[PDB]
């Protein structure tokens, strides 16, 4: 209709089941609470770019170049301002 709906939803997904709770306006599709998983594995795959054994999360390819990008921006902006 013309009504605005706000919904903060938190859900824990596990191999044995997935839990979901909503703090806000209703959502028709989601059944609140724990619902069992039809299979005993977690249906989410983690992709870990530039994976390191000592890091939980992967690393973006922009991270090594980021300080150089900052330096490039600094030099270019200073040159433009001076010009």
């Amino acid at each position: 209709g013309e009504n605005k709906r706000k919904a903060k939803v938190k859900q824990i997904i596990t191999a044995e089941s997935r839990f979901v709770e909503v703090e806000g306006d209703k959502i028709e599709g989601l059944e609140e609470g724990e619902t069992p998983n039809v299979w005993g594995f977690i249906p989410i795959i983690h992709f870990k770019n530039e994976a390191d054994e000592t890091l939980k999360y992967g690393q973006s390819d922009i991270e090594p170049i980021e300080p150089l990008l900052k330096a490039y921006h600094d030099v270019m902006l200073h040159a433009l301002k001076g010009s």
């Binding site: 300080p67 900052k70 330096a71 600094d74």
Partner: protein, 103 residues
């Protein structure tokens, strides 16, 4: 006593102590105040030794130094005191560092 020193820097009683205190308050260093006092004292020669520098009467003639010479000496004294004060104040040349953050 600073005022006694200032009087000894100006040959004593031509001014009164209020003017001397005012001069000392004008500039922290005594020599700048003494230079200003000397410049102001140069004005008073117009009364102390008038324009009549020489005169003869009867068997007597007296040839005083003209007012221009006296004020020239007073200004020379003031300039010397100012130079001495700047000598007390001025420091030599220097070279220092520069630093600006970068990342």
């Amino acid at each position: 006593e600073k005022l006694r020193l200032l009087l000894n820097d100006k040959d004593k009683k031509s001014f009164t102590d209020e003017e001397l205190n005012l001069f000392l308050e004008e500039a922290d260093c005594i020599y700048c105040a003494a230079s200003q006092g000397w410049i102001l004292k140069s004005l008073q020669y117009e009364n102390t030794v008038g324009e009549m520098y020489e005169y003869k009467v009867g068997q007597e003639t007296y040839k005083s130094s003209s007012i221009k010479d006296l004020v020239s000496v007073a200004y020379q004294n003031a300039d010397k005191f100012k130079d001495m004060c700047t000598n007390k104040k001025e420091k030599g040349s220097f070279m220092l560092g520069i630093s600006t953050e970068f990342e």
